[PDB]
Amino acid sequence: VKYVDKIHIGNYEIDAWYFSPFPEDYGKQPKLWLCEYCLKYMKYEKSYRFHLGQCQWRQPPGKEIYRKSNISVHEVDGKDHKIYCQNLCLLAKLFLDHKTLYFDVEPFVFYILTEVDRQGAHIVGYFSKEKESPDGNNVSCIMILPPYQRRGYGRFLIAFSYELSKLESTVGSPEKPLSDLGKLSYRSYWSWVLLENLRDFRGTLSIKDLSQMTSITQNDIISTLQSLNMVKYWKGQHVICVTPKLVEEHLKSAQYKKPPITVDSVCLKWAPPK
């Protein structure tokens, strides 16, 4: 009843954070070996090395809905690529506590973030999304592989998820409960997006205005402004209350000085030209 506790994927060895229900015989091995392109999981270095020489995948399946320079996103329908998405969900569960869904991947669309070189498109992370979210969740689960965490890739995927919400003419919010790292990442993302808009629009924006500009829900906006102490309350209404000294002294922290990977909406292929 040994669990999977270590994986080898690409040129990375990664320790597990949580139990993932790989078949029992796969957990018995010291490490489990993942093809970084098709996400097939294997029990031995020799089966892994043989697969690397045979596997012709060099990128995620599905449609490449984003490509700028060597940063790429693939949209993968869980129904059209069931095995690939199950493998993805088992991999993700090694690093996600709350994720309970691994094999019934059909209700979901998966957005795979990759980093490309001459060899292929190397998986960095993903977020899943319900094709029909009754709550209004524009992200179900989001996971960045540990060697890529805290390096801007999670920020890119969060920004990407709100770009999709904009093109759908809707607001959206990540599904709860958030992971520990997702909660910090969303709070940091919401802060920068809201603080940048208030700096560049003179604050002449309501909470509803910000919600339409960013596809962030009014609730997530309000709780973020509350954390920034930038909202007044008047007769049941939340009112933005902000000055330049407030905006700048919150913006000029070290948090908002790493240059992001940036979602260039020009390179997002949402609708075909015909």
Ligand X SMILES: O=C(NNS(=O)(=O)c1ccccc1F)c1cc(F)cc(-c2ccccn2)c1
Distance CA 11, CA 117 (A): 14
Cβ proximity to Mg ion: between 12 and 256 the closer is 12
Among 179, 211, 214, 217, binds ligand X (CB under 6 A): 179
Measured CA to CA, the distance from residue 160 to residue 139 in angstroms comes to: 10
Tokens 């209004």 — which residue? Answer: 136
Question: How many residues are present in the chain?
Answer: 274
Told to check if 15 binds Mg ion by CB under 5 A, we report yes
| Region 61-120 residues binding Mg ion, contact defined as CB under 5 A | none
Burial of 149 (0-12, 13-18, 19+ CB in 10 A): middle
Q: Tell whether residue 126 is a contact of ligand X (CB under 6 A).
A: no
**Residues ending a continuous segment of the chain before a break (C–N > 2.5 Å):** none
Binding of residue 150 to ligand X (CB under 6 A):
yes
| CB of 35 vs Zn ion, minimal distance in Å | 3
Is 112 a binding residue for ligand X by CB under 6 A? The answer is: no
Whether omega for the bond prior to residue 146 falls within 30 degrees of 0, making it cis, is: no
> Can 36 be counted among the known catalytic residues?
no
DSSP-derived pairing of the beta strands 121-130 and 108-116: antiparallel
Q: Is 172 in the site for ligand X (CB under 6 A)?
A: no
Among the residue ranges 49-57, 106-114, 132-140, 203-211, the one whose residues contact Zn ion (CB under 5 A): 49-57
C-alpha 217/C-alpha 115 separation (Å) is: 30
**Which region, judged by CB under 5 A, interacts with Zn ion, from 14-22, 37-45, 197-205, 262-270?**
37-45
Binding status of residue 14 toward Mg ion by CB under 5 A: yes
Choosing from 132, 168, 175, 249, the catalytic residue is: 175
Residue type, 223: S
CB neighbours (10 Å) of residue 139? 25
Q: Which residues are catalytic?
A: 175
Q: Which residues form the interface with ligand X (CB under 6 A)?
A: 95-96, 142-144, 149-155, 158, 179, 181-182, 185, 188-189
Q: Name the site residues for Zn ion (rule: CB under 5 A).
A: 35, 37-38, 40, 55
Which residues in this chain contact Mg ion in the complex, by CB under 5 A?
14-15
